[PDB]
């Protein structure tokens, strides 16, 4: 489709129904199953996993995580296609948004499957292929959080993906719900973590790199740099404050400078900066902690 | 479509009931696609059905262009949006049908009595035509479809026919020789208990192999991608090179046709085009050569020119008589040359620089091209192709060799007929390029200097054109075009020129003979 | 529980062939020096003929996605289906690849498969795909799982040719299904403990003498006897043995007390065996049956044999340790114990006894990889150069040229490989690395001279000089031999110069043969090489 528009010929579909054929259908299908188990409906939660009366049993819980693995692979491949290219086009942004919405709905459905300490569903998804999907999403999050934050035109994609990460961590917490000492679910989760050591390490560095931004802004050194109520601080002032604070390294300094959008006036608003970065960082960091 | 669906579903096993109306509906759908581009997409929306109902009447001749496979080809024909939106399973179904045709015998023909072979050329040719239309669109090659098709073709090697399949196949050249031998053989060619009654097995085999070669050559990546160095394109091109050896292509090009002849009574005895080696077979070979292997080596170019290209052009020249010109052999030869050979020689124009050691060969090429230009059945576009090719070749052609062409031109260009116009351009550009060769005694050191025979011939050309233009009736375009030529000749001739009072006598009597100069 | 193949794990690729209505189990094999083309080694009848897994083992360096492969070409993780994996041949150190050249066995589409020195390019890389519908893209590749490999460069599958008389492995569009066996994994292998496939020296209880064969001055079938030598032989290639387990899978595991294994002599290629007369004797691979060639390590002389124990899939528990653990070799079937006969250049005969003496303790010392590779290279060179000399002898005896086999291409290729092996270090290299290369080159030259590689080269030079001219050699042998006569003759002299250069002991042993060399200095076809050799010796 991209080559089709590039060659200049008229296209019936602008966004393109060919990629992600039916986005509303999958979302409705998984929202139906999430509503079916909402309210910690343990009876229907167990009946989805094992139909006792029926002659043959279909594991909806396993099929859901299979679809989650497939959509994780699709998202990872789309990321890998877009890794080299500097800027994400509109079609890429729409496809990422639709895929992230679908993944978020699947994670919500899995979370409603596993909440209400449903031990059967928890043990089924423990032995299912959830861990590979989670480790794929962890790498995707580790690399998007570096890439998108540097640019300023994909902030909506960044926040949608950060919400996806929060939902994944809530799903992991619901897995850990009702855990026992030296539990098999915990062992498998730590195996997943040590498998994804580098990705989660990068995510944690990205989180605690922006979690100190509130302290940096509230420091008196920044206050004397910006005594104005309007708060639009100069880029040079913010840059020099970032080493005067003595808690940000040079790499963090240059990364925040790159992640800092500036107007033609060569200045930045620390208020918009912090509300743009810190809040998702705190929200997801609490769940990770 | 619903009428055709009902009839095709009714009694599908026992061939097709009421084949005439099915053919009429397929023709109507093809024409509906051809009417407008949106109708083509509307028909493309149901391309899936035509694929599982492709094997309807492919074996039976006289239904060509009126089968569901033809309707699918028309729906996917020359539409880039449709070619790009074409899916991979749709190509896979056709590839599977081609594999089935390559593995299995043709039950209908062997039932009617045709000799039994292990593969189906008549269906395979149609299935290869559909793949050609799927992969190739508007001069360019759709890389996405071409890579999928070539990958499926190499995953199923049985699609290549017994010769190129690889279990001890005799090779492309051997297969072509055996097919012609079958063609002259009456027993193997026909069932032996007008054309639809007797499908010629040799022609089926040659058309199958030429269609496979044509499809692979069209699937070859574009040269711009090769220059960019894209690894997938390099891989596909190397795979095609491995699939088809260059020597087999050279041999098939070297194979000669059978020229028509008149009989004892003098009546033209013309072998039927439905039985024999077609120029389109060589046209596919040339296309594969130029798109896959690439023509960039000078000695290779001249070797191919001698072995396969020049004999065919000389045969076309010898079959330029007015009675034999109207024969469809001559038309097919002119079509093949002007579509493949002359464009290839025009693209190979820079390589024609170092041809001193093959002066006889290059002079023979010039003479044959000129004789084909001096023709009647030659169409307007064919004349254009001849003009461009000859003007390109004579451009980089070294002035030493073309004095044969000059000495034959100085006798027939003074006529100032419409056939003299491209000699006029040729002389104009040649003298403009080789101005300092003639005027300056030293000239180019590598080229040398005039032998004074060229100088005398240029004197004769100047005087003949000058006189014939005075005696010539007014045509303002003719005086536009003859002006630069006359001026270039006058400038090239050194003002202090010595016309030898002792000229050479007893010249080539064939040159003055206007009946073909032979 | 199911294991998964990871990077840096050593594996063996197996293929199944039902030749003549009987199923055979084959393995992908390749030899570093000499023929680079891969060949298949049968492992079905391991009972009567031992398998040579040493040249069949491959290690999985890197597993990467196809797009990552594209990016790295433009400018421990478990194996997952769909990745592109890189295989390094364990012995040679080269990488498996498509050679882009074919033997043209009426399969013009197929491409031959061999080894490549450099990993650069997409030829070395191969992609693993699911064999059946149970497997799927992206999931972990289980151990003991059948796999199909796809060439990245040529898009040709690893194929086993059935139609030809001799089975060949090549890259063809048809699919041959390959199973993967975990031969070993050095990631969790404890250092200092004996594992299968090692090359070791059997040291007698006086930790001074090795279990060695007669030296290289004695001819073949006089080297078949087994005895004890001490002193300089401990640092030679005639004291090296390889412990080969009777199991194909997991043959690199730690050796347990009582595990049956075969001891193969590295330099000769023969297997230790027990003859019916209770006398130890080296005996050939073809007749190397399990019954004759089976020996076990026992911690104590006490007679309570372990009997039968279940085999464990993996490294297992490390029991035998190098240099400290005392091992007593006993034959499995006969039950006798290895001991010194104590006959009355020590030449302590090794004999096979029901009871034996008390000081039968045998220590184990691990041999370096460089020395093991040098010994294997020596064995291969011995085989190839003996074939060459026998062919030349037949040609001299006037046997028909077609009947006689003359390894023209293989001898030349092995000669260039040996030149590369004995190439002196370059000067721009760092000092410590240069000193290490000098030490390695000196060790290689010493091992070659101790195995007597000089005399073989001298014999080849003489039997090539019996033909005066290239035209004369082309009249006697084939025309290709005629063209290769100059190249092989020059390469042999260059090899001799490389073997003698910088080695005072080798140049001293070459003093006797100097007079032979100077007698042909007048010959123009070898004057430069003869003069270079003379200069080095002087």
């Amino acid at each position: 489709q991209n080559k089709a528009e590039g060659l200049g010929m008229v296209t019936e579909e602008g966004s393109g129904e060919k990629v992600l054929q039916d986005d509303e259908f999958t979302c409705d299908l998984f929202r139906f199953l999430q509503l079916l188990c909402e309210g910690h409906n343990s009876d229907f939660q167990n009946y989805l996993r094992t139909q006792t009366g029926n002659n043959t049993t279909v594991n909806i819980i396993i099929s859901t995580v299979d679809y989650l693995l497939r959509v994780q692979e699709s998202i990872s491949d789309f990321y890998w296609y877009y890794s080299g290219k500097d800027v994400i086009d509109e079609q890429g942004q729409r496809n990422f948004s639709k895929a992230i919405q679908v993944a978020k709905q699947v994670f919500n459905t899995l979370t409603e499957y596993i909440q209400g300490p449903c031990t059967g569903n928890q043990q089924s998804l423990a032995h299912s292929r959830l861990w590979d999907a989670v480790v794929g999403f962890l790498h995707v999050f580790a690399h998007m959080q570096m890439k998108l934050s540097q640019d300023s035109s994909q902030i909506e994609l960044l926040k949608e993906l950060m919400d996806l990460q929060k939902d994944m961590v809530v799903m992991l917490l619901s897995m850990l719900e009702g855990n026992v000492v030296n539990g098999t679910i915990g062992k498998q989760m730590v195996d997943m973590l040590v498998e994804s050591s580098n990705n989660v390490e990068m995510i944690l560095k990205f989180f605690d790199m922006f979690l100190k931004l509130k302290d940096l802004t509230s420091s008196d050194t920044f206050k004397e740099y910006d005594p104005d109520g309007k708060g639009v601080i100069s880029k040079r002032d913010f840059h020099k404050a970032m080493e005067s604070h003595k808690h940000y390294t040079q790499s963090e300094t240059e990364f925040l400078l790159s992640c800092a959008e500036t107007d033609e006036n060569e200045t930045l608003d620390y208020e918009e900066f912090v509300k743009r970065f810190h809040e998702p960082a705190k929200d997801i960091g609490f769940n990770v902690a | 479509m619903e009428v055709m669906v009902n009839v095709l579903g009714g009694g599908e096993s026992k061939e097709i009931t009421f084949p005439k109306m099915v053919a009429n509906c397929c023709r109507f759908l093809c024409y509906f696609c051809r009417i407008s581009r949106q109708n083509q997409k509307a028909m493309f929306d149901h391309l899936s059905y035509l694929l599982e109902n492709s094997s309807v009447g492919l074996a039976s001749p006289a239904m060509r262009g009126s089968t569901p496979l033809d309707v699918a080809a028309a729906s996917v024909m020359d539409n880039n949006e449709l070619a790009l939106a074409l899916r991979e399973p749709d190509l896979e179904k056709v590839v599977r049908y081609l594999a089935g045709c390559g593995l299995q015998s043709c039950q209908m023909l062997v039932s009617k009595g045709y000799p039994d072979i292990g593969w189906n050329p008549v269906e395979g040719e149609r299935y290869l035509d559909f793949l050609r239309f799927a992969v190739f669109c508007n001069g360019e090659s759709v890389e996405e479809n071409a890579n999928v098709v070539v990958r499926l073709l190499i995953r199923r090697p049985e699609c290549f026919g017994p010769a190129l399949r690889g279990e001890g196949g005799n090779g492309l050249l051997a297969a072509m020789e055996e097919a012609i031998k079958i063609a002259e053989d009456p027993s193997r060619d026909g069932p032996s208990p007008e054309e639809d009654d007797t499908i010629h097995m040799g022609n089926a085999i040659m058309t199958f192999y030429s269609a496979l070669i044509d499809l692979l050559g069209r699937c070859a990546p574009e040269m711009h991608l090769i220059h960019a160095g894209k690894g997938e394109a390099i891989r596909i091109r190397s795979i095609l090179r491995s699939l088809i050896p260059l020597g087999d292509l050279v041999g098939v090009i070297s194979i000669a046709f059978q020229m028509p002849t008149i009989a004892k009574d003098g009546n033209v005895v013309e072998p039927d085009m439905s039985a024999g080696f077609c120029p389109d077979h060589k046209a596919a070979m040339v296309l594969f050569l130029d798109r896959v292997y690439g023509i960039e080596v000078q000695d290779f170019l001249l070797h191919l020119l001698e072995v396969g290209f020049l004999p065919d052009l000389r045969a076309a020249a010898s079959l330029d008589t007015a009675a034999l010109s109207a024969t469809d052999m001559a038309l097919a030869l002119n079509r093949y040359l002007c579509t493949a050979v002359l464009p290839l020689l025009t693209r190979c124009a820079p390589l024609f620089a170092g041809t001193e050691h093959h002066a006889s060969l290059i002079d023979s090429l010039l003479h044959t091209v000129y004789r084909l230009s001096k023709g009647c059945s030659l169409t307007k576009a064919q004349r254009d192709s001849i003009e461009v090719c000859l003007l390109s070749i004579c451009g980089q052609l070294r002035p030493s060799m073309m004095q044969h062409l000059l000495r034959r031109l100085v006798f027939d260009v003074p006529l100032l007929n419409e056939h003299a116009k491209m000699p006029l351009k040729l002389l104009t550009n040649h003298y403009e390029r080789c101005w300092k060769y003639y005027c300056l005694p030293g000239g180019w050191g590598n080229f040398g200097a005039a032998s004074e025979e060229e100088l005398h011939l240029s004197r004769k050309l100047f005087w003949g054109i000058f006189d014939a233009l005075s005696q010539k009736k007014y045509e303002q375009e003719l005086f536009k075009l003859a002006l630069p030529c006359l001026s270039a000749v006058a400038g090239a001739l050194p003002p202090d020129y010595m016309e030898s009072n002792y000229v050479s006598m007893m010249e080539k009597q064939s040159s003055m003979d206007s009946e073909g100069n032979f | 529980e199911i294991q998964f193949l990871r990077t840096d794990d050593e594996v063996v690729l197996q293929c199944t062939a039902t030749i003549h209505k009987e199923q055979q189990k084959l393995c992908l094999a390749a030899e570093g020096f000499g023929n680079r083309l891969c060949f298949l080694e049968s492992t079905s009848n391991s009972k009567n003929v031992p398998p040579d897994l040493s040249i069949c083992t491959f290690v999985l360096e890197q597993s990467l996605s196809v797009r990552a492969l594209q990016e790295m070409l433009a400018n421990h993780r478990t194996l997952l289906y769909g990745h592109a994996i890189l295989l390094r041949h364990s012995y040679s150190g080269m990488y498996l690849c498509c050679l882009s050249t074919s033997r043209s066995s009426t399969d013009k589409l197929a491409f031959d498969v061999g080894l490549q020195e450099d990993t650069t390019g997409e030829a070395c890389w191969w992609t693993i795909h699911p064999a059946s519908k149970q497997r799927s893209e992206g999931e972990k590749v289980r151990v003991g799982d059948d796999l199909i490999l796809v060439s990245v460069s040529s898009e040709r599958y690893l194929h086993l040719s059935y139609g030809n008389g001799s089975l060949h492995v090549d890259a063809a569009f048809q699919q041959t299904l390959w199973s993967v066996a975990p031969i070993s994994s050095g990631s969790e292998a404890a250092q200092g403990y004996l594992i299968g496939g090692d090359v070791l020296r059997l040291l007698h209880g006086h930790m001074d003498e090795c279990l060695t064969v007669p030296s290289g001055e004695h001819g073949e079938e006089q080297r078949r006897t087994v005895h004890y030598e001490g002193g300089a032989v401990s640092v030679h290639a005639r004291s090296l043995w390889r412990l080969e387990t009777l199991r194909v899978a997991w043959s690199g595991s730690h050796i347990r007390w009582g595990q049956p294994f075969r001891l193969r002599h590295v330099t000769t290629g023969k297997y230790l065996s027990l003859m019916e007369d209770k006398n130890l004797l080296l005996m050939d691979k073809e007749k190397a049956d399990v019954k004759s060639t089976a020996f076990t390590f026992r911690s104590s002389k006490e007679k309570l044999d372990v009997g039968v124990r279940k085999e464990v899939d993996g490294m297992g528990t490390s029991e035998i340790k190098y240099g400290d653990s005392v091992c007593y070799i006993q034959h499995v079937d006969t039950g006798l114990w290895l001991t010194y006969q104590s006959v009355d250049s020590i030449q302590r005969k090794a004999i096979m006894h029901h009871e034996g003496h008390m000081d039968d303790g045998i220590s184990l010392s691990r041999s370096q990889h460089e020395e093991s590779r040098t010994a294997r290279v020596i064995r291969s060179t011995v085989f190839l150069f003996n074939r060459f000399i026998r062919g030349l002898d037949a040609l001299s005896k006037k046997a028909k040229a077609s009947t006689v086999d003359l390894p023209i291409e293989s001898v030349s290729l092995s000669l260039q490989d040996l030149i590369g092996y004995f190439h002196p270090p370059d000067e721009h290299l760092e000092h410590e690395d240069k000193q290490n290369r000098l030490r390695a080159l000196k060790n290689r030259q010493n091992l070659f001279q101790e195995e007597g590689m000089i005399n073989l080269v001298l014999e080849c030079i003489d039997r090539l000089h019996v033909y005066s001219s290239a035209a004369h050699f082309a009249d006697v042998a084939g025309r290709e031999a005629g063209e290769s006569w100059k190249s092989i003759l020059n390469s042999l002299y260059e090899l001799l110069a490389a073997l003698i250069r910088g080695n005072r002991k080798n140049c001293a042993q070459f003093s006797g043969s100097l007079d032979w060399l100077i007698s042909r200095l007048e010959r123009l076809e070898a004057s430069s090489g003869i003069l270079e050799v003379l200069h080095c010796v002087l």
Side-chain angles (χ1 to χ4, degrees), chain A residues 73 80-81 129 132, chain C residues 67 71 137-139:
Chain A
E73 275 153 357
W80 269 115
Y81 168 79
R129 295 184 57 95
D132 187 56
Chain C
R67 329 174 60 264
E71 301 144 22
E137 295 292 330
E139 67 182 2

PDB file of all heavy atoms in Angstrom, chain A residues 73 80-81 129 132, chain C residues 67 71 137-139:
ATOM      1  N   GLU A  73       3.819 -10.472  18.069  1.00  0.00           N
ATOM      2  CA  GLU A  73       4.743 -10.665  16.958  1.00  0.00           C
ATOM      3  C   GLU A  73       4.504  -9.657  15.843  1.00  0.00           C
ATOM      4  O   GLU A  73       5.466  -9.121  15.281  1.00  0.00           O
ATOM      5  CB  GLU A  73       4.627 -12.089  16.411  1.00  0.00           C
ATOM      6  CG  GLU A  73       5.470 -13.108  17.160  1.00  0.00           C
ATOM      7  CD  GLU A  73       4.903 -14.511  17.071  1.00  0.00           C
ATOM      8  OE1 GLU A  73       3.817 -14.679  16.479  1.00  0.00           O
ATOM      9  OE2 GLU A  73       5.548 -15.448  17.590  1.00  0.00           O
ATOM     10  N   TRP A  80      10.165  -3.319  14.077  1.00  0.00           N
ATOM     11  CA  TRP A  80      11.440  -3.607  13.434  1.00  0.00           C
ATOM     12  C   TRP A  80      11.509  -2.989  12.044  1.00  0.00           C
ATOM     13  O   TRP A  80      12.577  -2.536  11.617  1.00  0.00           O
ATOM     14  CB  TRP A  80      11.665  -5.118  13.380  1.00  0.00           C
ATOM     15  CG  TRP A  80      12.412  -5.648  14.573  1.00  0.00           C
ATOM     16  CD1 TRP A  80      11.938  -6.511  15.519  1.00  0.00           C
ATOM     17  CD2 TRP A  80      13.755  -5.326  14.961  1.00  0.00           C
ATOM     18  NE1 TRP A  80      12.906  -6.757  16.463  1.00  0.00           N
ATOM     19  CE2 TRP A  80      14.030  -6.041  16.145  1.00  0.00           C
ATOM     20  CE3 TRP A  80      14.752  -4.508  14.422  1.00  0.00           C
ATOM     21  CZ2 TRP A  80      15.261  -5.962  16.797  1.00  0.00           C
ATOM     22  CZ3 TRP A  80      15.973  -4.430  15.070  1.00  0.00           C
ATOM     23  CH2 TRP A  80      16.216  -5.153  16.245  1.00  0.00           C
ATOM     24  N   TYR A  81      10.381  -2.957  11.332  1.00  0.00           N
ATOM     25  CA  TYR A  81      10.326  -2.241  10.061  1.00  0.00           C
ATOM     26  C   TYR A  81      10.580  -0.750  10.256  1.00  0.00           C
ATOM     27  O   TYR A  81      11.297  -0.122   9.470  1.00  0.00           O
ATOM     28  CB  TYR A  81       8.977  -2.477   9.381  1.00  0.00           C
ATOM     29  CG  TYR A  81       8.717  -1.557   8.209  1.00  0.00           C
ATOM     30  CD1 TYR A  81       9.296  -1.794   6.969  1.00  0.00           C
ATOM     31  CD2 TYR A  81       7.884  -0.454   8.342  1.00  0.00           C
ATOM     32  CE1 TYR A  81       9.059  -0.952   5.896  1.00  0.00           C
ATOM     33  CE2 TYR A  81       7.639   0.392   7.277  1.00  0.00           C
ATOM     34  CZ  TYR A  81       8.228   0.139   6.056  1.00  0.00           C
ATOM     35  OH  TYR A  81       7.987   0.979   4.993  1.00  0.00           O
ATOM     36  N   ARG A 129       1.923 -19.599  26.710  1.00  0.00           N
ATOM     37  CA  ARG A 129       2.999 -18.844  26.083  1.00  0.00           C
ATOM     38  C   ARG A 129       2.905 -17.352  26.376  1.00  0.00           C
ATOM     39  O   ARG A 129       3.285 -16.527  25.538  1.00  0.00           O
ATOM     40  CB  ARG A 129       3.014 -19.094  24.576  1.00  0.00           C
ATOM     41  CG  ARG A 129       3.341 -20.526  24.206  1.00  0.00           C
ATOM     42  CD  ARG A 129       3.444 -20.695  22.705  1.00  0.00           C
ATOM     43  NE  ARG A 129       4.449 -19.798  22.150  1.00  0.00           N
ATOM     44  CZ  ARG A 129       5.708 -20.140  21.917  1.00  0.00           C
ATOM     45  NH1 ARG A 129       6.159 -21.349  22.209  1.00  0.00           N
ATOM     46  NH2 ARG A 129       6.537 -19.244  21.391  1.00  0.00           N
ATOM     47  N   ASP A 132       6.566 -15.336  26.497  1.00  0.00           N
ATOM     48  CA  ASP A 132       7.177 -14.856  25.262  1.00  0.00           C
ATOM     49  C   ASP A 132       6.530 -13.564  24.769  1.00  0.00           C
ATOM     50  O   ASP A 132       7.231 -12.650  24.319  1.00  0.00           O
ATOM     51  CB  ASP A 132       7.097 -15.935  24.179  1.00  0.00           C
ATOM     52  CG  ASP A 132       7.863 -15.557  22.923  1.00  0.00           C
ATOM     53  OD1 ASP A 132       9.074 -15.274  23.029  1.00  0.00           O
ATOM     54  OD2 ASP A 132       7.258 -15.550  21.831  1.00  0.00           O
TER      55      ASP A 132
ATOM     56  N   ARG C  67      16.024  -9.842   9.661  1.00  0.00           N
ATOM     57  CA  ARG C  67      16.238  -8.417   9.435  1.00  0.00           C
ATOM     58  C   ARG C  67      17.491  -7.931  10.152  1.00  0.00           C
ATOM     59  O   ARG C  67      18.199  -7.049   9.656  1.00  0.00           O
ATOM     60  CB  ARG C  67      15.025  -7.606   9.879  1.00  0.00           C
ATOM     61  CG  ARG C  67      13.683  -8.291   9.753  1.00  0.00           C
ATOM     62  CD  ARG C  67      12.602  -7.410  10.364  1.00  0.00           C
ATOM     63  NE  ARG C  67      12.528  -6.123   9.676  1.00  0.00           N
ATOM     64  CZ  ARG C  67      13.121  -5.006  10.077  1.00  0.00           C
ATOM     65  NH1 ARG C  67      13.854  -4.965  11.178  1.00  0.00           N
ATOM     66  NH2 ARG C  67      12.993  -3.905   9.342  1.00  0.00           N
ATOM     67  N   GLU C  71      20.631  -6.053   8.461  1.00  0.00           N
ATOM     68  CA  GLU C  71      21.243  -4.828   8.969  1.00  0.00           C
ATOM     69  C   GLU C  71      22.742  -5.004   9.193  1.00  0.00           C
ATOM     70  O   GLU C  71      23.545  -4.146   8.798  1.00  0.00           O
ATOM     71  CB  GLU C  71      20.557  -4.388  10.264  1.00  0.00           C
ATOM     72  CG  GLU C  71      19.064  -4.104  10.157  1.00  0.00           C
ATOM     73  CD  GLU C  71      18.314  -4.513  11.404  1.00  0.00           C
ATOM     74  OE1 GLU C  71      18.954  -4.625  12.478  1.00  0.00           O
ATOM     75  OE2 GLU C  71      17.084  -4.719  11.299  1.00  0.00           O
ATOM     76  N   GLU C 137       6.460 -20.834  13.826  1.00  0.00           N
ATOM     77  CA  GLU C 137       7.443 -19.761  13.779  1.00  0.00           C
ATOM     78  C   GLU C 137       7.513 -19.028  15.113  1.00  0.00           C
ATOM     79  O   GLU C 137       6.488 -18.729  15.733  1.00  0.00           O
ATOM     80  CB  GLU C 137       7.091 -18.771  12.665  1.00  0.00           C
ATOM     81  CG  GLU C 137       7.166 -19.336  11.256  1.00  0.00           C
ATOM     82  CD  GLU C 137       8.583 -19.652  10.827  1.00  0.00           C
ATOM     83  OE1 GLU C 137       9.515 -18.968  11.300  1.00  0.00           O
ATOM     84  OE2 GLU C 137       8.767 -20.573  10.004  1.00  0.00           O
ATOM     85  N   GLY C 138       8.738 -18.739  15.554  1.00  0.00           N
ATOM     86  CA  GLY C 138       8.989 -17.895  16.696  1.00  0.00           C
ATOM     87  C   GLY C 138       9.152 -18.631  18.013  1.00  0.00           C
ATOM     88  O   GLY C 138       9.703 -18.060  18.962  1.00  0.00           O
ATOM     89  N   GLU C 139       8.690 -19.875  18.099  1.00  0.00           N
ATOM     90  CA  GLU C 139       8.781 -20.590  19.360  1.00  0.00           C
ATOM     91  C   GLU C 139      10.167 -21.208  19.534  1.00  0.00           C
ATOM     92  O   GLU C 139      10.957 -21.310  18.592  1.00  0.00           O
ATOM     93  CB  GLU C 139       7.712 -21.678  19.453  1.00  0.00           C
ATOM     94  CG  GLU C 139       7.879 -22.821  18.479  1.00  0.00           C
ATOM     95  CD  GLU C 139       6.758 -23.831  18.594  1.00  0.00           C
ATOM     96  OE1 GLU C 139       5.836 -23.608  19.407  1.00  0.00           O
ATOM     97  OE2 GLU C 139       6.805 -24.854  17.884  1.00  0.00           O
TER      98      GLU C 139
END
